[PDB]
Ligand SMILES: CCCCCCCCOCCOCCOCCOCCO
Ligand SMILES: CCCCCCCCOCCOCCOCCOCCO
Ligand SMILES: CCCCCCCCOCCOCCOCCOCCO
């Protein structure tokens with residue numbers, strides 16, 4: 042069985058003083074298509090393979106290709122995946138909760154380097170023999186994530202640095218907790234990174250949360266993000282502040298709104314200020330299909 | 331929702347004295363696949379994204395990729411599209427009416443340079459930041475087309491030449507009229523091009539038409555194409571003559587036939603003579619799926 | 620009509636002393652997706668086009684593209700195909716019968732060079748104007764195969780070497796026979812190769828066969844492969860020995876098993892020894908979807 046799903050997104054992307062002789066405002070857009078093949082068995086074991094084909098404005102050669110395959114096996118709530126895997130630090134809950142705008146960005150996101158699913162090919166050739174193994178599992182309302190990423194599996198292992206990550210999250214109906222930890226993240230030796238986050242649903246309509254991170258060898262240092270959102274019908278308002286230890290950094294912040302036009306259609310915008318005083322703004326749509 | 335459609339075509343392509351040590355006759359063939367994702371809303375607004383994957387004999391690396399995305403929004407007969415758009419000069423009716431053979435070619439087609447939907451990637455990198463906006467609408471039996479193409483939207487606009495085009499066509503059951511006009515076509519400054527055409531369905535089986543063009547800065551000069559077709563059951567006969575102002579040019583002409591073998595299957599051939607006395611012939615099939 | 624099918628495979632691939640500073644054991648995996656468009660007619664003629672998108676671990680740029688199109692026409696048991704065709708030497712029965720392991724390999728396979736369907740693009744550019752014509756037909760339980768492959772159809776034919784192949788196989792319920800012959804195989808002048816094979820189903824569960832080959836200009840010389848398999852429920856045991864004329868070559872051999880876990884799911888392994896004493900082992904899964 043083969044199924045196809047994905048999403049399109051387009052709108053305006055403003056970056057104050059982008060560059061000498063550059064336009065600050067552009068039309069940014071993304072097409073994402075996923076090809077999924079699955080084999081269900083009567084034994085209860087499911088086999089799967091996924092490929093992504095992603096295009097973004099500005100991409101080299103005005104063309105689209107697929108990425109590197111991901112394969113998995115699922116049985117009784119346990120999923121083992123091989124190849125281009127989702128990593129633990131990139132999959133836990135709460136870590137991307139401050140993202141806003143139609144491009145889902147936030148300076149409140151972790152300012153570290155770590156491996157994550159690769160959406161596209163990489164012309165530099167660095168991903169050619171990259172191969173990860175991942176394992177996910179769910180006890181009660183607990184989600185467990187584990188991932189092992191080998192940047193070049195053909196080369197003797199004593200010569201390459203492997204990335205290892207673990208994460209768990211948990212949620213009842215009002216509190217959410219999450220934590221992750223990865224060593225040698227992004228294959229950078231000694232770049233050990235951590236995350237702890239918690240959220241409180243103080244209503245059917247509002248939630249506040251707080252994320253803390255150890256950014257490893259990044260120049261950002263430790264970081265804290267405080268965010269909150271509130272829904273008024275089909276409209277959601279979101280905001281966040283974030284600080285990093287880097288001397289002289291500014292406080293980053295953002296304010297945005299989401300409007301659920303229809304099932305599968307979402308109009309979003311935001312105005313954000315980064316740690317180096319960058320001003321960024323956006324407004325556009327996402328539709329899922 | 332994701333749907334796939336497209337077509338295959340193959341047959342013989344003859345070019346008299348193609349080149350020293352080249353074969354005049356080859357097997358030319360094309361595979362075109364379109365991936366379309368759509369999101370229908372109960373509000374009446376439809377969202378869409380399309381990608382094309384096209385392969386042609388002789389293509390570099392013996393491979394296929396997708397092109398650059400096209401996105402659109404439709405509401406009440408109005409469609410706005412962004413990215414790799416169809417342009418006004420390329421979409422009006424009647425402008426390609428003389429095309430024949432299984433490759434749908436004609437020297438009677440406009441001999442100018444103008445932007446059009448890009449089927450494939452471009453290795454030269456010229457299309458990397460190309461971005462168009464297009465708008466179509468239909469009053470009675472009137473079709474209105476408008477398009478704005480920015481060859482490099484990241485660069486300050488005072489440095490790049492944008493293409494702007496408008497077109498309309500109209501048809502009752504016997505007369506057809508169409509006109510288009512585009513300035514700085516193909517991003518060439520001062521290359522303003524125009525088209526006017528008209529057709530007369532003098533029967534259920536026969537039609538005659540005439541197309542005139544201002545080819546802008548091309549060396550062809552103004553051009554006139556006179557064509558006609560006539561259907562005998564599943565068989566269609568077509569012919570056209572065309573002249574350009576270029577001194578010493580020959581009159582171009584073509585004669586071909588189409589045979590509708592089955593729904594979705596069409597066998598075509600033609601013999602054409604160009605403006606520089608080139609002799610070209612073809613015979614093959616197209617099937618849609 | 621467009622349909623999608625394919626398969627995923629993953630597991631461990633061991634090559635004794637692969638290379639200085641290389642890992643002998645890797646995770647090898649393959650994702651194959653086929654896109655097939657067909658047009659059925661009421662006349663009985665079917666038109667088809669196929670494209671493949673294949674990714675393998677270690678592939679350049681960590682990406683996937685499609686290959687070169689294949690087109691065909693089928694009528695009354697006769698199929699003519701154009702472009703990236705299956706060749707006669709690569710399609711006859713019995714020639715790959717000794718293949719085992721989850722990667723379906725065998726040193727008992729023919730050690731010659733010959734054209735075959737191209738799965739992927741080729742960066743070297745050698746396949747750019749490659750074009751084959753193929754014809755298959757089936758009398759009783761007879762299968763007839765014919766193929767003509769032109770490595771560069773744009774160039775004058777007196778300058779290029781074309782590959783021509785024929786094959787037939789036949790089977791009742793217990794004996795199988797097959798033979799093939801191709802001249803200038805792989806476009807190498809004078810590299811004429813041949814194959815004869817026969818198999819005996821000495822049970823519902825067991826089969827023994829023997830394949831002989833003239834490897835043309837290869838350094839292997841003539842070759843003989845003797846193989847056998849036997850099924851015990853969902854488990855299949857397979858083995859083969861193979862010899863080549865090359866002086867000092869070793870006898871190659873392999874032993875493996877296949878376990879049919881479920882419809883569409885197959886777990887395989889093997890231990891093989893090549894003609895130069897190479898030791899290779901594998902274990903993994905294949906699932907079809
Ligand atoms: C500002 C640089 C020049 C680009 C022209 C800006 C014109 C804006 O777009 C007009 C046509 O519509 C498409 C743009 O996508 C963004 C629209 O807002 C998203 C839906 O709420
Ligand atoms: C990103 C999708 C893959 C498409 C990119 C292929 C890149 C090919 O170019 C690599 C650079 O070398 C130049 C190639 O020669 C011409 C390419 O093909 C011609 C028709 O579009
Ligand atoms: C300056 C060039 C144009 C690009 C900028 C578009 C940025 C537009 O503003 C972003 C949206 O601001 C969100 C407001 O926060 C309040 C939310 O509730 C109000 C509307 O539903």
Ligand SMILES: CCCCCCCCOCCOCCOCCOCCO
Pocket residue numbers: 340341342355356357597613614615699701752
């Ligand atoms: C002329 C150069 C060498 C190529 C051989 C020409 C042989 C013609 O094709 C024979 C096999 O069939 C496939 C060709 O596609 C064209 C057939 O006509 C189209 C359907 O009406």
Ligand SMILES: CCCCCCCCOCCOCCOCCOCCO
Pocket residue numbers: 390391393394395678679684685739740741742
């Ligand atoms: C046109 C479809 C895209 C496929 C073209 C990829 C072009 C890659 O080559 C660019 C030129 O540089 C050489 C690349 O190194 C080898 C490529 O991949 C090997 C297996 O086929």
Ligand SMILES: CCCCCCCCOCCOCCOCCOCCO
Pocket residue numbers: 342343344355565567585586587599600601611612613
């Ligand atoms: C010379 C190498 C072969 C390639 C050339 C094939 C060209 C064949 O002729 C094209 C078809 O000619 C069309 C004829 O116009 C009359 C139409 O009605 C008659 C048949 O239905």
Ligand SMILES: CCCCCCCCOCCOCCOCCOCCO
Pocket residue numbers: 121123174629630631644645646886902903904
């Ligand atoms: C040996 C080099 C380092 C690679 C680690 C080997 C660990 C083996 O895999 C553990 C995780 O599972 C995925 C591997 O695919 C092969 C499993 O066997 C196939 C099914 O029978």
Ligand SMILES: CCCCCCCCOCCOCCOCCOCCO
Pocket residue numbers: 100101106107161162163164679680682683684
């Ligand atoms: C194999 C699938 C096709 C993808 C390969 C495209 C190969 C492009 O590189 C050719 C070598 O030249 C370097 C290209 O410049 C950067 C590429 O695109 C950037 C984003 O991934």
Ligand SMILES: CCCCCCCCOCCOCCOCCOCCO
Pocket residue numbers: 631632633644854856874875876888889890900901902
């Ligand atoms: C040495 C690193 C690991 C990689 C090697 C895996 C190789 C494993 O063995 C292959 C399977 O051997 C097949 C045995 O033949 C007997 C068949 O019946 C028994 C089991 O069903």
